[PDB]
């Protein structure tokens, strides 16, 4: 008994959940009207991709 024989892996597979519920970045950088700098608009971003 000399060595050990192995089957080397061939490909790499990455499976994750389907992409949905993206963070509303399109509502921040693309707005019809912006805000003055003194009254700067602050939006909290959570529970989203």
């Amino acid at each position, epitope marked *: 008994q000399t060595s050990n024989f192995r089957v080397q892996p061939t490909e790499s597979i990455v499976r994750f959940p389907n992409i949905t519920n993206l963070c509303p970045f399109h509502e921040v950088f693309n707005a019809t*009207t912006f*805000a*003055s700098v003194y*009254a700067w*608009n*602050r939006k909290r971003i959570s529970n989203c991709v």
Partner: nanobody
Framework: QVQLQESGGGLVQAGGSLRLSCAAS????????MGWFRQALGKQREGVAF???????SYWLPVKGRFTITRDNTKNTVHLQMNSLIPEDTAVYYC?????????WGQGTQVTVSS
């Protein structure tokens, strides 16, 4: 989405009286401060007078007696009373709602005086 209803403008002779009114419907979050701006024909935009939510008033022109601000807490509206009207105040007016996060603007009222 906030709608600022403007009403009470038009043609008035010298020394007349009128009552501008801005009603803020929509978001208009609780710590609001309401103000009025003046836009002379082809000139810069200056601030008529501002009223806060604690009834504190800050007039941005030596104009006391001319403008008086009345507050309606039940409907969160602001009325501007105009008296002793003189030709140099002939300008369109917009009301300014700072709210807390995003400030808004009115549509416009034509205030005119001549003789």
């Amino acid at each position: 989405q906030v709608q600022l209803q403007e009403s009470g403008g038009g043609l008035v002779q010298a020394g007349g009286s009128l009552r501008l009114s801005c009603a803020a419907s929509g978001s208009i979050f609780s710590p609001n401060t309401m103000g009025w701006f003046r836009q002379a024909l082809g000139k810069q935009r200056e601030g008529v007078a501002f009223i806060s939510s604690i009834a504190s008033t800050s007039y941005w022109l030596p104009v006391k007696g001319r403008f008086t601000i009345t507050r309606d807490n039940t409907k969160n509206t602001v009325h501007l009373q105009m008296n002793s009207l003189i030709p140099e105040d002939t300008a369109v007016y917009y009301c300014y709602a700072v709210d807390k996060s995003q400030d808004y603007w009115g549509q416009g009222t034509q205030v005119t005086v001549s003789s």
